[PDB]
Design a protein around this nucleic acid. Sequence first.
RNA 1: UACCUGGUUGAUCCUGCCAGUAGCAUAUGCUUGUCUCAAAGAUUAAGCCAUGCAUGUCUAAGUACGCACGGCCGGUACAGUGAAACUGCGAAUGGCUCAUUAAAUCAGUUAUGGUUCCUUUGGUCGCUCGUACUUGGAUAACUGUGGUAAUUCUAGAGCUAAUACAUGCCGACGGGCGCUGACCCCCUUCGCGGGGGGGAUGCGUGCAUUUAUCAGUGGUGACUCUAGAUAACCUCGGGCCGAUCGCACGCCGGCGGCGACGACCCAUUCGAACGUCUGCCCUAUCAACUUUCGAUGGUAGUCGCCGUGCCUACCAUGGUGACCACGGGUGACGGGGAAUCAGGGUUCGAUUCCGGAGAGGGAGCCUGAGAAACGGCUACCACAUCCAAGGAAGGCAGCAGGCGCGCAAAUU
RNA 2: UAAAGUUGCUGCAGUUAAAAAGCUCGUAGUUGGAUCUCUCUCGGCCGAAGCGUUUACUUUGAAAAAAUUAGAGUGUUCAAAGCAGGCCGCCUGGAUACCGCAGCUAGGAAUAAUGGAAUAGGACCGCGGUUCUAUUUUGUUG
RNA 3: CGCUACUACCGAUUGGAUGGUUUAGUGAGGCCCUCGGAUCGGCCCCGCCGGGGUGCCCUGGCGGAGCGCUGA
Lengths: 64, 151, 262, 205
Amino acid sequence: PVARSWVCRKTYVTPRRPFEKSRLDQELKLIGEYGLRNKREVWRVKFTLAKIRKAARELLTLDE
Amino acid sequence: ADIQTERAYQKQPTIFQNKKRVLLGETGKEKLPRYYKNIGLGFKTPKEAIEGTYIDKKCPFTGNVSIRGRILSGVVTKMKMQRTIVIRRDYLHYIRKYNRFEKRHKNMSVHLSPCFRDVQIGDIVTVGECRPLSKTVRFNVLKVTKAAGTK
Amino acid sequence: ARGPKKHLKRVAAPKHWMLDKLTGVFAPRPSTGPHKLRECLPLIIFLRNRLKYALTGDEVKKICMQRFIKIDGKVRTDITYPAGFMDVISIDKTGENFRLIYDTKGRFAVHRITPEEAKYKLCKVRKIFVGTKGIPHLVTHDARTIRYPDPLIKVNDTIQIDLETGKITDFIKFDTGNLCMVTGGANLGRIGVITNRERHPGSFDVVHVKDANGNSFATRLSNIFVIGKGNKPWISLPRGKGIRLTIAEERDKRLAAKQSSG
Amino acid sequence: GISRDNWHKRRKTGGKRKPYHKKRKYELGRPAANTKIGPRRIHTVRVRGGNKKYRALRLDVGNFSWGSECCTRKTRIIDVVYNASNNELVRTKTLVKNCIVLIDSTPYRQWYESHYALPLGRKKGAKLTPEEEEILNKKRSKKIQKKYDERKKNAKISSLLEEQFQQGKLLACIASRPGQCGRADGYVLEGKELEFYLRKIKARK
RNA sequence: UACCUGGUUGAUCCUGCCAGUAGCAUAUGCUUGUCUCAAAGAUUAAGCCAUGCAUGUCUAAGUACGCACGGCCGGUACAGUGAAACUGCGAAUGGCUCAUUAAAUCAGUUAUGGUUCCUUUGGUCGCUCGUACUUGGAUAACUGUGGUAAUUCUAGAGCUAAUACAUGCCGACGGGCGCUGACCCCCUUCGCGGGGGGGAUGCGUGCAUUUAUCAGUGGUGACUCUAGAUAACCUCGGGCCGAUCGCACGCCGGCGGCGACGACCCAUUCGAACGUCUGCCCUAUCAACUUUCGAUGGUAGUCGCCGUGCCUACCAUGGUGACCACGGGUGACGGGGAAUCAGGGUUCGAUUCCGGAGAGGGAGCCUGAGAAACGGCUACCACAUCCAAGGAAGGCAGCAGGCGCGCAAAUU
RNA sequence: UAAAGUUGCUGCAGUUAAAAAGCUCGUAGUUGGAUCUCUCUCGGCCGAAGCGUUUACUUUGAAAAAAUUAGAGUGUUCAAAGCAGGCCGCCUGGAUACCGCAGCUAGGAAUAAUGGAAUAGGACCGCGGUUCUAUUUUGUUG
RNA sequence: CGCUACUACCGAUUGGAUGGUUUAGUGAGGCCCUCGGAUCGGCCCCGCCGGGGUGCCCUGGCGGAGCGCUGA
């Protein structure tokens, strides 16, 4: 037993198709336009928006 | 009839039958009041329990058994034991993957008090939970409902 | 395990203690006493986590061993002493009295009471029995035994105990129309008038309760603690009067309070 | 050092069971107190919770009650005559609960004579021993004499008990457990219970 | 993000698998600047372990004649601090690990009206009609004499304590109650058929225990509950009814305040134990199993903390099974949970929380409220340490650490 | 693990690609046609007012550890986190949802199963009828 | 069929090494029981000095050489 917490979470998701020209171009455009270090920053913001959309969708299935 | 069938004397432990009574003051038999109790939960004491002569220490009504816990029901399946019957409880168990049910059953050995005379195979019995009465018996028959086809 | 357990893991502690997760591995295991382990607030949690009078368990011990803390009128030096519902905590050095009273969230509020109110406490009678050559005895939720109670007092009633002498001075019957708090379950900490008691022989009676705002809930009979005759409590209630606001009304009240400042 | 667990037994289906732990102390059992008849000998047993059990190894005296007369007396136990569980317990003269024993009738005879002013179990040829005709007759006033006369109307004793009192020993059932409390208490057999046990004893011998 | 792509043919459309694709978890390779969290000898070997440490503990309040320190030279027993030792309490918690274990454990649900419960908290504690202004003998520590190669081995001798171990009383206490019954009074009929009383000697009284009987204070859905009454029992291995310690001080020989400690008993708390209902992986190349080597039920008992074939003796012939019994396997502790996932599912869960189990393998116990305890004991089995060869001493699946094992895991 | 609708309950196949037993009977299993729209305490607004054959189902309500998950609040400098914090002593948090199955509870009555009388051993009821309650309405078995 | 390599299978090579299961016999050690009684201690006898009790030997200090009881 320790007084430590192991609640940790990955903040991004790797794309299913590694070498897809359209997605590579879109991500590089975002990186260059916003001065991002790598593709993981794009994937992190994408993951944030994806979780928000999932929550909104699950709320939209409930009664008004 | 012949209550004393065992090697030891059979009597209700709470009834004193050796009180001194003069001969000329006899009306019927000298003295043998019958011990019985009303179990709770709205169950009616069978008339055979009140006016019977059987000695059963595991009887819910005239014995030393307190009914507490679960009240269950079953159909009488076998009656080949002394003061004990085997009932069958049928139920449906839900398997979630297939969203369906399966028939399962459990056999339960319950004590049958001799107050329920004329109990057949296939009629419903309401049993109540008591302390362990033997290795496998933990329920006492409290009510007997006859089968639908029984005339 | 062999014999009794002596430790309590911090994460297995009752959630209403509002202990965090990174302070330590252990929570203060309440000592045996008047109240159950999960229905009590140890003295250390009260004097350190709620009142902030101490920063550590060592300082809680330092306070307790100066005999400054009274629980139900008696000085207690056990820092894990189980203080529970209705218990009166008196700190005469700082001149403050508290009564351990549930919040609408199910937590023991820091509820300060007047020194006149600190003279008595309500107790729900757990059982009535005759013993010792016809002497009637009464046992409360506080686990105190009282000989020669009033013949009208029955189980589930509420008595008023004068802490100085510890004898019954008044009692409320368990009747429909009497104010009551809930001391367990989902509705823990809610205050309302008893509407009806549905009886289930051989099982748990259910008591229905209606809030002062008209909200109706239900609990088991073992979770009902009669507080006052009619709708008037015999004790002081916390800032929330036992009315459990929904999360929407809590949000609205918080937003209104925040927007009123600045 | 025997055990008392239920998991060493076959299941209801008759299948074999696998022990998942070794014997626990609370499942323990102890050797039987084969309580003989003899000069008193009791060994105290320390039991669970720190309490005491009184393992009677020898008992010559018990406390037996004449239920109809409500006359409880301390009495020497003479013999074991019937055992519904095992006939061997009779052969070894073991005192257990519900075993039928012979007890001295002298205390109950003394109470009966001092209460009813009536002889009991006394041979007609004899003319009483010295220093007991007084307690039988005494010098009583009119009130005491009429009290005993009123008692005399309910002094009839059943013939079976009367014959036992003639023989000097009564049949009794031990109602306590000597191996757990160290005592052989019980009640004198009477009525249909006495009839049943006399029939059983005479069928056995 | 509810997704596909390459590969059979000369070419085509398919079935279909192989390969690709993304996560996840172990290992490994190459590389590695900052900073915050953070797993870490589970997998193979519940294999073996050098060494060290991991459980001890004193308040005003059990026992202080250790000058070991220390004063106020005395009808001044004990100033005080205090090693040691006796006494008490804990050592049954925690930590580790997952070998066993397939309705077993476990989970939810109920029950104990079928049990035990140190401690805490509250109550009860002159409720007993029968040396006290304080009783007895020891033993430690200490002094002194020793033995063995060897140990947390201990043996003689000389003292001396108790909240250790024993014994045991004034008092409340005046008597009441019950059952006895030498005797006396009054009235009615001098058929006392009847009554009413006072009563001296005697026995027994409270709580607890055991048995039998009686009557119907409160309570339950339901007692053979609680309470009451009677007749007695009342364990030599004999139960309660205080021979205890500190502080503050008093009051015209008595009466006391505040505590500490202890003892029944009853509640309470913390539990434990044992039952209820439902739910567990694969396997039929496992279809019948169990049956007094108790198997299922009955009666009586024994034992047990208690319910119970728990065991025993008689009696009956039962009980489970294709709704999969029984048997077998599990690189099976169960669960909360984890990974992945459109919906549905699939796989995992040794692993910090809960429950279980174990301490090299079995078995058996002592003490205690609680252990079938292993940082307790006894024995056997395996391994193993010292030896002067006579004996003695063992248990890291605790924390580090070592060996071994391995693909695989950190600081004595 | 997804991709694998290559284990298919959702949701796959069986003419020739792998595949329907040679053919019937047949028990268990599975599945089965229409049909049926008082209150034996009553007192001058209050309660002894009934799972009223039953179950499945559905909708409730209790009760159900925490942590994890979801999720509310909160500028950890951001974030993973944490359960903190905020304002010039005071103020405010430490929510909430979910928690299969089984068990308990209460409404609904479609769907599904089940039951009620045909040998009348039938429902409501006026009239009878052969043991027997230990409360009798106030000087106690006078 | 001939080669070469690999893999299961059959099988008395009357093969070598551990793992278990079990009739028969033996059985450590603990616990219980029935005995046992090395020792130790109390009350009367070669303990007899001493007390609020005077020649009441009777103790609260020493084998009181005791088929005398008694407890451990």
